[PDB]
Amino acid sequence: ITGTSTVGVGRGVLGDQKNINTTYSTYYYLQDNTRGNGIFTYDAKYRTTLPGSLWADADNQFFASYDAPAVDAHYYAGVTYDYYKNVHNRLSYDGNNAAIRSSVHYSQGYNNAFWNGSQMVYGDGDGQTFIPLSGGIDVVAHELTHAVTDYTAGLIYQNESGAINEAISDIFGTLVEFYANKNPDWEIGEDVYTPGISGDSLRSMSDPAKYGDPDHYSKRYTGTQDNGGVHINSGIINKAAYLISQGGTHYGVSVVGIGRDKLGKIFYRALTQYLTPTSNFSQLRAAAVQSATDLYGSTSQEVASVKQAFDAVGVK
C-alpha cells in the first residue's frame, strides 16, 4: 500500500519484544519499505486461502497473542533479507529485490511451514508438536531459502536433488540463526518444536541420527515417503556441511573445520553457479569442490576439507 514508513513495537511467539518496520495509511500495516521492494505480512485468519489480508493494526503496537506469529514472520524475514544482502550480495530471493510475502495463521492446527511457489506460509501448530512456526528464525530462513533455491539451482523436490534442496534450506536457516546470534545452534526448529519437551528439535545437523535421519550415504532412504526422503536424506548433506564448518572425525574420517563463513561462501557459490535442477549428491560434492577451488585455490585447506567431509558421509 502507499503510505509512510513507520516503526511499530511488538512481542513475538516466545514473548520477546522487537521493533518492526510498518507502513501508515489509516491503519498501520506489516509492510517494511526499508528492504528491497518491501516485506509484506498477511493474516490468513485460520483459513487456507492465500495470501489473506495485508496485516492491519490500529495503533502500531503488536502485543496481542494473535499478533505474535505475524511479528516474528515479518521481523525474521527482514533478518534473512539482511543476511543474503550483507553476506552474499543477493537482493531478495530473485536477486532483483522481489517483494517478500508471508502469511501467518494458516489453517487450523497446522504443523508446518512452506514456500508455495510465490510466498511463505506458516501454521500455528497444534500446540503439542509445534507452536506458531514463524517463532523460529531458522524456520523462517529455511522457508525463504526455498525461494532462493527455486530461483537459482532449481533443485527438483524429490529424491537426491530434493534432499539437497532441503539441506540447503537447513544450512542457510542455520547460518541465518548464527548471523542473528541469539541462542544459535546446529539444530533445526528447536524454538518452536514440542513445547512440552526440552532439548529436542525437528532435525539435527551435528548428529542427524539423533532423530533417525541418516549420517552416511550407505544409510540413505530409498522409498517413496516424503518425496523420496527429502527431509530424511538431507541429513547426509547436513552432516557434511556441519563437518566442513566445525570439523570432526566421523566413521573414522577426520575433517579439519574451516568455519561457518567459509561454509556459507562455498555452498552459496555452489547453489548459484554450479547446481542444476537434477543435481545428485555426487554432483553436489563436485560443485562444492569447484566452488572452494574458485574461492580459496586448488591447494587450499578449504578444498581439502570439502573432500574430507563428503568422504566422511560416503559421497564420492
Ligand X SMILES: CC(C)C[C@H](NP(=O)(O)CNC(=O)OCc1ccccc1)C(=O)N[C@@H](CCN)C(=O)O
Which residues carry out catalysis? 143, 231
Q: Is 138 in the site for Ca ion (CB under 5 A)?
A: yes
Q: Which of 16, 82, 94, 185 binds Ca ion (CB under 5 A)?
A: 185
Q: Which of 155, 164, 188, 255 binds ligand X (CB under 6 A)?
A: 188
Q: Which stretch binds Ca ion (CB under 5 A): 13-21, 105-113, 148-156, 183-191?
A: 183-191
Residue 22, annotated as binding a ligand = no
Residue 170, annotated as binding a ligand = no
Residues that bind Zn ion (CB under 5 A): 169
Q: Is 112 in the site for ligand X (CB under 6 A)?
A: yes
Residue 57: C-alpha distances to residues 31, 43, 63, 95 (Å) = 11, 11, 11, 31
Q: Is 141 in the site for ligand X (CB under 6 A)?
A: no
Q: How far apart are CA 94 and CA 39, in angstroms?
A: 14
Residue 194, annotated as binding a ligand = yes
Of 105, 118, 116, nearest in space to 53 by CA: 105
Minimum CB–partner distance for residue 76 and ligand X (Å)? 12
Residue 64: C-alpha distances to residues 68, 87, 103 (Å) = 7, 34, 17
Q: Is 32 in the site for ligand X (CB under 6 A)?
A: no
Query: Residue 129 or residue 293: which is nearer to ligand X going by CB?
Result: 129
- Contacts of 135 by beta carbon, 8 Å cutoff, 6+ apart: 12, 13, 14, 68, 69, 72, 191, 192
Query: Residue 116 or residue 246: which is nearer to ligand X going by CB?
Result: 116
Query: Residue 1 or residue 197: which is nearer to ligand X going by CB?
Result: 197
Query: Residue 43 or residue 166: which is nearer to ligand X going by CB?
Result: 166
Do 42 and 104 contact (CB within 8 A), yes or no? Answer: yes
Which residue has the CB atom at the shortest distance from ligand X?
A: 114
∠ at Cα 174 (22, 75), nearest 5°?
Answer: 5
Angle of the 260-269 helix axis to the 281-296 helix axis, nearest 10: 110
Tell me which residues touch ligand X (CB under 6 A). Answer: 111-114, 116-117, 133, 139, 142-143, 146, 157, 188-189, 202, 226, 231
Tell me which residues touch Ca ion (CB under 5 A). Answer: 57, 59, 61, 138, 177, 183, 185, 187, 193-194, 197, 200
Residue ranges of the annotated binding site for Ca(2+) are 57, 59, 61, 138, 177, 183, 185, 187, 190, 193-194, 197, 200
